[PDB]
Paper text:
Here, by solving the crystal structure, it is shown that [name] from [name], a GH5-family endo-β-1,4-glucanase (EC 3.2.1.4), has a bipartite architecture consisting of a Cel5A-like catalytic domain with a (β/α)8 TIM-barrel fold and an inserted CBM29-like noncatalytic domain with a β-jelly-roll fold. [name] contains a Cel5A-like CD similar to TmCel5A from Thermotoga maritima, but has an additional novel domain inserted into an internal site in the CD. Unlike other known cellulases with CBMs at the termini, this inserted [name] in the newly identified [name] acts in synergy with the CD, as demonstrated by ITC experiments.
To investigate the origin of the disparity in catalytic efficiency between Δ[name] and [name], we crystallized Δ[name] and solved the structure by molecular replacement using the CD of [name] as a search model. The orthorhombic P212121 crystal contained one molecule of Δ[name] in its asymmetric unit. The apo-form structure of Δ[name] displayed an intact TIM-barrel fold. The crystal structure of Δ[name] presents almost the same polypeptide conformation as observed in the CD of [name], with an r.m.s.d. of 0.28 Å for 260 pairs of Cα atoms. In [name] (and also in TmCel5A) the β6–α6 loop is 30 residues long and contains the substrate-binding Trp224 (Trp210). Direct elimination of the [name] from [name] resulted in a shorter connection between this loop and the α6 helix, the equivalent of which in TmCel5A has one additional turn. Although the overall fold remained intact, the lack of flexibility in the tightened-up loop would probably have reduced the catalytic efficiency of Δ[name]. Similar results were obtained using the soluble substrate CMC. The kinetic data indicated that without the [name] domain, the K m of Δ[name] increased nearly ninefold and the k cat decreased by more than tenfold. The lower enzymatic activity of Δ[name] is not due to structural damage to the catalytic center, the integrity of which was demonstrated by analyzing the hydrolyzed products using mass spectroscopy.
Residue numbers in the entry: 17 to 327
The structure:
Protein backbone atom coordinates (compact mmCIF):
# COMPACT_ATOMS: atom_id res chain seq x y z
CA UNK A 1 0.00 0.00 0.00
CA UNK A 2 0.82 3.66 0.48
CA UNK A 3 3.52 3.06 3.11
CA UNK A 4 5.42 0.96 0.60
CA UNK A 5 4.87 3.52 -2.21
CA UNK A 6 6.43 6.13 0.10
CA UNK A 7 9.32 3.83 1.00
CA UNK A 8 9.87 3.34 -2.76
CA UNK A 9 10.41 7.10 -3.13
CA UNK A 10 13.63 6.66 -1.13
CA UNK A 11 16.30 9.22 -1.97
CA UNK A 12 15.44 11.73 -4.66
CA UNK A 13 16.46 14.94 -6.39
CA UNK A 14 14.50 17.85 -7.85
CA UNK A 15 15.03 18.88 -11.46
CA UNK A 16 14.84 22.55 -10.49
CA UNK A 17 15.36 25.80 -12.35
CA UNK A 18 13.76 24.00 -15.30
CA UNK A 19 10.02 23.48 -16.01
CA UNK A 20 8.88 25.55 -13.03
CA UNK A 21 10.37 28.75 -14.49
CA UNK A 22 8.28 30.85 -16.91
CA UNK A 23 9.64 28.55 -19.63
CA UNK A 24 12.22 25.81 -19.84
CA UNK A 25 15.67 27.38 -19.65
CA UNK A 26 14.57 30.76 -18.33
CA UNK A 27 16.10 29.95 -14.94
CA UNK A 28 19.21 28.29 -16.34
CA UNK A 29 18.44 24.55 -16.64
CA UNK A 30 17.10 22.90 -19.78
CA UNK A 31 16.40 19.22 -19.24
CA UNK A 32 18.58 16.64 -21.02
CA UNK A 33 18.02 12.91 -21.41
CA UNK A 34 21.43 12.13 -19.89
CA UNK A 35 20.33 13.65 -16.55
CA UNK A 36 18.25 10.56 -15.80
CA UNK A 37 21.17 8.16 -16.05
CA UNK A 38 23.44 10.49 -14.05
CA UNK A 39 20.90 10.69 -11.26
CA UNK A 40 20.51 6.94 -11.16
CA UNK A 41 24.25 6.41 -11.13
CA UNK A 42 24.55 8.77 -8.19
CA UNK A 43 22.24 6.62 -6.06
CA UNK A 44 18.90 8.40 -6.37
CA UNK A 45 15.65 6.47 -6.91
CA UNK A 46 13.36 9.43 -7.63
CA UNK A 47 13.04 12.57 -9.72
CA UNK A 48 10.82 15.37 -8.42
CA UNK A 49 9.69 17.40 -11.47
CA UNK A 50 8.53 20.93 -10.59
CA UNK A 51 6.16 22.13 -13.31
CA UNK A 52 4.59 25.60 -13.40
CA UNK A 53 1.63 24.86 -15.66
CA UNK A 54 0.15 28.35 -15.22
CA UNK A 55 2.55 29.84 -17.79
CA UNK A 56 1.47 27.28 -20.39
CA UNK A 57 -2.32 27.11 -20.03
CA UNK A 58 -5.12 29.15 -21.51
CA UNK A 59 -6.59 31.80 -19.21
CA UNK A 60 -10.16 31.24 -20.42
CA UNK A 61 -12.05 27.99 -20.10
CA UNK A 62 -11.35 25.23 -20.88
CA UNK A 63 -7.85 26.37 -19.79
CA UNK A 64 -6.12 24.06 -22.24
CA UNK A 65 -2.44 23.28 -21.61
CA UNK A 66 -0.20 24.10 -24.57
CA UNK A 67 0.33 20.84 -26.50
CA UNK A 68 4.06 21.38 -27.07
CA UNK A 69 4.65 22.00 -23.36
CA UNK A 70 2.52 18.98 -22.44
CA UNK A 71 4.61 16.82 -24.77
CA UNK A 72 7.79 17.99 -23.01
CA UNK A 73 6.36 16.82 -19.67
CA UNK A 74 5.31 13.54 -21.32
CA UNK A 75 8.91 13.07 -22.40
CA UNK A 76 10.30 13.68 -18.91
CA UNK A 77 7.80 11.27 -17.32
CA UNK A 78 8.45 8.58 -19.92
CA UNK A 79 12.23 8.88 -19.82
CA UNK A 80 12.43 8.82 -16.03
CA UNK A 81 10.02 5.86 -15.84
CA UNK A 82 11.71 3.80 -18.55
CA UNK A 83 15.07 4.35 -16.91
CA UNK A 84 13.82 2.96 -13.60
CA UNK A 85 13.26 6.17 -11.62
CA UNK A 86 10.13 7.23 -9.82
CA UNK A 87 8.83 10.63 -10.86
CA UNK A 88 6.78 13.12 -8.83
CA UNK A 89 4.78 15.43 -11.14
CA UNK A 90 3.47 18.52 -9.35
CA UNK A 91 1.87 21.87 -9.89
CA UNK A 92 4.64 24.19 -8.76
CA UNK A 93 4.66 28.00 -8.88
CA UNK A 94 1.21 29.46 -9.36
CA UNK A 95 1.12 33.07 -8.26
CA UNK A 96 -2.50 33.54 -9.28
CA UNK A 97 -3.79 30.63 -7.20
CA UNK A 98 -1.84 31.50 -4.03
CA UNK A 99 -3.06 35.09 -4.28
CA UNK A 100 -6.72 34.25 -5.03
CA UNK A 101 -7.68 30.60 -4.46
CA UNK A 102 -11.40 31.08 -5.01
CA UNK A 103 -11.03 33.02 -8.29
CA UNK A 104 -8.33 30.77 -9.73
CA UNK A 105 -9.92 27.47 -8.61
CA UNK A 106 -11.61 26.66 -11.93
CA UNK A 107 -8.37 26.98 -13.92
CA UNK A 108 -6.34 24.98 -11.36
CA UNK A 109 -8.90 22.15 -11.27
CA UNK A 110 -8.96 22.07 -15.09
CA UNK A 111 -5.17 21.77 -15.07
CA UNK A 112 -5.39 18.81 -12.66
CA UNK A 113 -8.10 17.15 -14.76
CA UNK A 114 -5.91 17.44 -17.85
CA UNK A 115 -2.84 16.04 -16.07
CA UNK A 116 -4.76 13.22 -14.33
CA UNK A 117 -6.58 12.10 -17.47
CA UNK A 118 -3.43 12.20 -19.57
CA UNK A 119 -1.35 10.17 -17.10
CA UNK A 120 -4.08 7.84 -15.81
CA UNK A 121 -2.32 4.73 -17.20
CA UNK A 122 1.18 5.51 -15.88
CA UNK A 123 2.59 2.95 -13.41
CA UNK A 124 2.77 3.38 -9.64
CA UNK A 125 6.24 4.88 -9.90
CA UNK A 126 4.52 8.07 -11.14
CA UNK A 127 3.21 10.18 -8.26
CA UNK A 128 1.04 13.33 -8.34
CA UNK A 129 1.69 16.31 -6.02
CA UNK A 130 -1.26 18.71 -5.74
CA UNK A 131 0.37 22.11 -5.05
CA UNK A 132 3.93 23.11 -4.19
CA UNK A 133 4.31 25.32 -1.10
CA UNK A 134 0.83 26.90 -0.67
CA UNK A 135 1.20 30.47 0.57
CA UNK A 136 -0.49 33.84 0.08
CA UNK A 137 -4.17 33.64 0.96
CA UNK A 138 -3.65 30.00 1.98
CA UNK A 139 -1.40 31.34 4.76
CA UNK A 140 -4.14 33.77 5.85
CA UNK A 141 -6.71 30.95 6.01
CA UNK A 142 -5.29 27.39 5.92
CA UNK A 143 -8.81 26.02 5.59
CA UNK A 144 -8.90 27.43 2.05
CA UNK A 145 -6.19 24.91 1.22
CA UNK A 146 -7.92 22.04 3.06
CA UNK A 147 -11.03 22.76 0.99
CA UNK A 148 -9.21 23.16 -2.32
CA UNK A 149 -6.95 20.09 -1.93
CA UNK A 150 -10.06 17.96 -1.34
CA UNK A 151 -11.56 19.29 -4.59
CA UNK A 152 -8.35 18.57 -6.49
CA UNK A 153 -8.03 15.07 -5.03
CA UNK A 154 -11.61 14.36 -6.10
CA UNK A 155 -10.73 15.46 -9.65
CA UNK A 156 -7.65 13.25 -9.70
CA UNK A 157 -9.52 10.26 -8.30
CA UNK A 158 -12.09 10.34 -11.08
CA UNK A 159 -9.39 8.97 -13.43
CA UNK A 160 -6.66 7.73 -11.00
CA UNK A 161 -8.40 5.86 -8.18
CA UNK A 162 -5.29 4.54 -6.43
CA UNK A 163 -2.30 6.64 -7.50
CA UNK A 164 -0.18 8.00 -4.66
CA UNK A 165 -1.02 11.71 -4.23
CA UNK A 166 1.37 14.00 -2.29
CA UNK A 167 -0.15 16.78 -0.15
CA UNK A 168 1.61 19.34 2.06
CA UNK A 169 0.60 22.04 4.57
CA UNK A 170 0.52 25.82 4.09
CA UNK A 171 3.31 28.21 5.13
CA UNK A 172 5.22 27.18 2.00
CA UNK A 173 4.91 23.52 3.10
CA UNK A 174 6.05 24.38 6.65
CA UNK A 175 5.96 21.33 8.95
CA UNK A 176 4.61 23.53 11.74
CA UNK A 177 1.49 24.05 9.65
CA UNK A 178 0.71 20.35 9.69
CA UNK A 179 -1.34 21.35 12.75
CA UNK A 180 -3.89 23.08 10.49
CA UNK A 181 -3.81 20.58 7.62
CA UNK A 182 -6.91 18.39 7.26
CA UNK A 183 -7.08 15.55 4.77
CA UNK A 184 -9.91 13.48 3.28
CA UNK A 185 -10.44 9.83 4.15
CA UNK A 186 -8.34 8.56 1.24
CA UNK A 187 -5.82 5.75 1.90
CA UNK A 188 -3.31 6.70 -0.82
CA UNK A 189 -2.00 10.06 0.40
CA UNK A 190 1.62 10.88 1.21
CA UNK A 191 2.16 14.00 3.30
CA UNK A 192 5.03 16.34 2.43
CA UNK A 193 6.86 19.29 3.94
CA UNK A 194 9.96 21.24 2.91
CA UNK A 195 12.90 22.04 5.17
CA UNK A 196 15.06 25.16 4.82
CA UNK A 197 15.57 26.32 8.43
CA UNK A 198 17.39 28.51 9.13
CA UNK A 199 16.38 30.60 6.13
CA UNK A 200 19.09 33.14 7.00
CA UNK A 201 21.61 30.42 6.23
CA UNK A 202 20.00 28.33 3.47
CA UNK A 203 18.76 31.37 1.53
CA UNK A 204 21.55 33.85 2.27
CA UNK A 205 21.89 36.18 -0.70
CA UNK A 206 18.75 34.74 -2.35
CA UNK A 207 17.67 37.62 -4.59
CA UNK A 208 14.22 36.14 -5.17
CA UNK A 209 13.37 36.89 -1.52
CA UNK A 210 12.37 40.23 -0.08
CA UNK A 211 14.05 41.17 2.09
CA UNK A 212 17.24 39.55 0.69
CA UNK A 213 19.09 37.89 3.59
CA UNK A 214 22.73 38.97 3.93
CA UNK A 215 25.58 36.63 3.08
CA UNK A 216 28.54 35.51 5.17
CA UNK A 217 26.39 33.30 7.41
CA UNK A 218 27.99 30.11 8.70
CA UNK A 219 26.17 27.09 10.10
CA UNK A 220 26.77 24.25 12.53
CA UNK A 221 24.39 21.73 14.04
CA UNK A 222 22.58 22.28 17.33
CA UNK A 223 19.15 20.69 18.06
CA UNK A 224 16.70 22.46 15.71
CA UNK A 225 16.77 19.76 13.00
CA UNK A 226 16.07 16.95 15.44
CA UNK A 227 13.27 18.96 17.10
CA UNK A 228 11.57 19.68 13.75
CA UNK A 229 11.75 16.13 12.43
CA UNK A 230 10.47 14.65 15.68
CA UNK A 231 7.46 16.98 15.57
CA UNK A 232 6.74 15.87 12.02
CA UNK A 233 7.13 12.17 12.78
CA UNK A 234 4.70 12.39 15.72
CA UNK A 235 2.18 14.17 13.52
CA UNK A 236 2.55 11.51 10.85
CA UNK A 237 2.13 8.71 13.41
CA UNK A 238 -0.94 10.27 15.02
CA UNK A 239 -2.52 10.84 11.61
CA UNK A 240 -1.30 7.56 10.01
CA UNK A 241 0.31 9.15 6.95
CA UNK A 242 3.75 8.47 5.41
CA UNK A 243 6.14 11.41 4.98
CA UNK A 244 8.13 12.64 1.95
CA UNK A 245 10.29 15.72 2.47
CA UNK A 246 10.22 17.05 -1.11
CA UNK A 247 12.79 19.87 -0.84
CA UNK A 248 15.75 20.70 1.36
CA UNK A 249 19.02 22.37 0.45
CA UNK A 250 21.36 25.34 0.99
CA UNK A 251 22.15 28.00 -1.62
CA UNK A 252 25.70 28.29 -3.04
CA UNK A 253 26.26 31.78 -1.59
CA UNK A 254 26.90 30.06 1.74
CA UNK A 255 30.32 28.58 2.38
CA UNK A 256 30.65 25.02 1.12
CA UNK A 257 31.63 23.40 4.43
CA UNK A 258 28.61 24.92 6.21
CA UNK A 259 26.33 23.74 3.37
CA UNK A 260 27.78 20.22 3.63
CA UNK A 261 27.31 20.15 7.42
CA UNK A 262 23.68 21.25 7.00
CA UNK A 263 22.86 18.90 4.10
CA UNK A 264 24.27 15.84 5.84
CA UNK A 265 22.59 16.70 9.13
CA UNK A 266 19.21 17.07 7.44
CA UNK A 267 19.54 13.89 5.34
CA UNK A 268 20.59 11.89 8.40
CA UNK A 269 17.62 13.07 10.45
CA UNK A 270 15.16 12.47 7.60
CA UNK A 271 16.28 8.86 7.24
CA UNK A 272 16.33 8.32 11.03
CA UNK A 273 12.61 9.20 10.93
CA UNK A 274 11.84 7.00 7.86
CA UNK A 275 11.07 10.01 5.68
CA UNK A 276 11.60 9.71 1.95
CA UNK A 277 13.08 12.87 0.46
CA UNK A 278 14.13 14.92 -2.54
CA UNK A 279 17.07 17.31 -2.42
CA UNK A 280 16.78 20.84 -3.87
CA UNK A 281 18.28 20.58 -6.46
CA UNK A 282 20.20 18.83 -9.27
CA UNK A 283 22.16 21.37 -11.30
CA UNK A 284 21.63 25.06 -10.47
CA UNK A 285 22.49 27.36 -7.54
CA UNK A 286 21.77 24.61 -5.00
CA UNK A 287 23.08 21.92 -7.33
CA UNK A 288 25.03 18.75 -6.65
CA UNK A 289 26.09 18.57 -10.32
CA UNK A 290 28.08 21.23 -12.19
CA UNK A 291 27.17 21.10 -15.87
CA UNK A 292 29.96 23.54 -16.78
CA UNK A 293 32.67 21.03 -15.79
CA UNK A 294 30.44 17.93 -15.95
CA UNK A 295 31.50 17.01 -12.41
CA UNK A 296 29.64 16.19 -9.23
CA UNK A 297 30.11 18.50 -6.26
CA UNK A 298 31.56 15.61 -4.29
CA UNK A 299 31.23 16.89 -0.68
CA UNK A 300 27.55 17.72 -1.16
CA UNK A 301 26.76 14.50 -3.05
CA UNK A 302 28.44 12.45 -0.32
CA UNK A 303 26.46 14.28 2.36
CA UNK A 304 23.36 12.94 0.56
CA UNK A 305 24.61 9.47 -0.43
CA UNK A 306 27.30 8.58 2.11
CA UNK A 307 29.72 5.73 1.51
CA UNK A 308 29.24 4.40 5.05
CA UNK A 309 26.07 4.69 7.12
CA UNK A 310 27.43 7.06 9.81
CA UNK A 311 29.22 9.42 7.36
N1 LIG B 1 27.51 27.43 -12.19
C1 LIG B 1 26.66 26.30 -12.55
C2 LIG B 1 25.53 26.11 -11.54
C3 LIG B 1 24.66 27.33 -11.27
C4 LIG B 1 24.88 28.29 -10.34
N2 LIG B 1 23.86 29.23 -10.37
C5 LIG B 1 22.95 28.87 -11.33
C6 LIG B 1 21.76 29.49 -11.73
C7 LIG B 1 21.05 28.90 -12.73
C8 LIG B 1 21.49 27.71 -13.34
C9 LIG B 1 22.68 27.10 -12.95
C10 LIG B 1 23.43 27.68 -11.93
C11 LIG B 1 26.07 26.50 -13.94
O1 LIG B 1 26.28 27.58 -14.50
O2 LIG B 1 25.41 25.62 -14.50
C1 LIG C 1 12.82 29.31 -2.01
S1 LIG C 1 14.06 28.73 -3.17
C2 LIG C 1 13.85 26.94 -3.21
C3 LIG C 1 12.81 26.57 -4.21
C4 LIG C 1 11.40 26.94 -3.79
N1 LIG C 1 11.15 26.55 -2.42
C5 LIG C 1 10.46 26.17 -4.66
O1 LIG C 1 9.63 25.43 -4.11
O2 LIG C 1 10.64 26.30 -5.89
Amino acid sequence: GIVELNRQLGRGVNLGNALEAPWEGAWGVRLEEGFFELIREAGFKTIRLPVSWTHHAGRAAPYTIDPAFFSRVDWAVTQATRRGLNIVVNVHHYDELNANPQAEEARYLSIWRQIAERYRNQPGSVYFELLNEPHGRFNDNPQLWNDLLAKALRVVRESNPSRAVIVGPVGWNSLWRLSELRLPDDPNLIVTFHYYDPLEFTHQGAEWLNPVPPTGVVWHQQNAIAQAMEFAQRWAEQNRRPIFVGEFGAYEKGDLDSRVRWTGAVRSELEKRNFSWAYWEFAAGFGIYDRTTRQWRTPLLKALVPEQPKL
